[PDB]
């Protein structure tokens, strides 16, 4: 008999190569009493069997999704998300990639919207120095944008204010 993993019906599905997005996912999962699930081992049940789904991904390659998200994208595109509450967060580097800042979060946004999800947790782009971002929609990010490389001093406040808006 294995535990469900958390008390609340919140699944935080993440990808990570160097551990930065993985640690942020655990921080989000703790405050929402949810499960942190790596997209490498995630199933479509992890996408479907939750009242609040949160997807997080860093941007790698050439403005692409993290490789595990790219490979396992079928688990998302085959998941029933119509009318389901979904939030997103992205890790990025606006100093070294100002023209592809947290683009992976924008790519996740197009996927969940394609599956009919109701996305919440839009944030503002005010305190960011970047030229282009696929996560930007009319002066707003489609989710929580974090920069653990050149702006990690603001991550705690950004997560704190973002979390309280998802409940």
Ligand X SMILES: Cc1cc2nc3c(=O)[nH]c(=O)nc-3n(C[C@H](O)[C@H](O)[C@H](O)COP(=O)(O)O)c2cc1C
Q: Which residues are annotated as a binding site for FMN?
A: 16-18, 20-21, 59-60, 63, 93, 100, 102, 149
CB of 76 to ligand X, least distance (A): 18
Residue of 19, 126, 139, 153 that binds ligand X (CB under 6 A): 19
CB of 51 to a second copy, least distance (A): 4
Q: How many angstroms separate the CA atoms of 51 and 99, rounded? A: 34
Q: Which residues pair with 52 in a beta bridge?
A: 10, 85
Tokens at 81, concatenated: 């998300």
Distances (CA, A) of 19 to 22, 70, 91, 121: 5, 17, 11, 23
CB of 33 to a second copy, least distance (A): 7
Annotated binding-site ranges: 16-18, 20-21, 59-60, 63, 93, 100, 102, 149
Instruction: Please report where in the chains the tokens 């998300």 appear, as a residue.
Output: 81
Angle at 115 between CA 128 and CA 162, to 5 degrees: 35
Site track for ligand X across 145-164, x = CB under 6 A = ---xx---------------
Q: Give residues in contact with ligand X (CB under 6 A).
A: 16-22, 58-60, 63, 91-93, 97, 100-103, 148-149
């Amino acid at each position: 008999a294995a535990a469900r993993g958390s008390h609340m019906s919140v699944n935080v599905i993440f990808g990570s190569d160097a551990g930065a997005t993985r640690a942020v996912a655990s921080r989000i999962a703790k405050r929402l009493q949810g499960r942190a699930v790596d997209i490498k081992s995630a199933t479509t049940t992890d996408f479907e069997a939750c009242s609040l789904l949160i997807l997080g991904a860093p941007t790698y390659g050439f403005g692409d999704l993290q490789t595990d998200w790219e490979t396992n994208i079928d688990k998302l595109t085959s998941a029933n998300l119509a009318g389901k509450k979904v939030a997103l967060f992205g890790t990025g580097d606006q100093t070294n990639y100002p023209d592809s800042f947290v683009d992976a979060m924008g790519l996740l946004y197009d996927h969940v919207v394609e599956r009919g999800a109701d996305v919440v947790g839009f944030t503002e782009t005010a305190g960011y120095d970047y030229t282009a971002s696929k996560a930007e929609r009319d002066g707003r990010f489609v989710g929580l944008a974090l920069d653990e490389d050149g702006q990690s001093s603001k991550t705690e406040k950004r997560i704190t204010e973002w979390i309280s808006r998802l409940t």
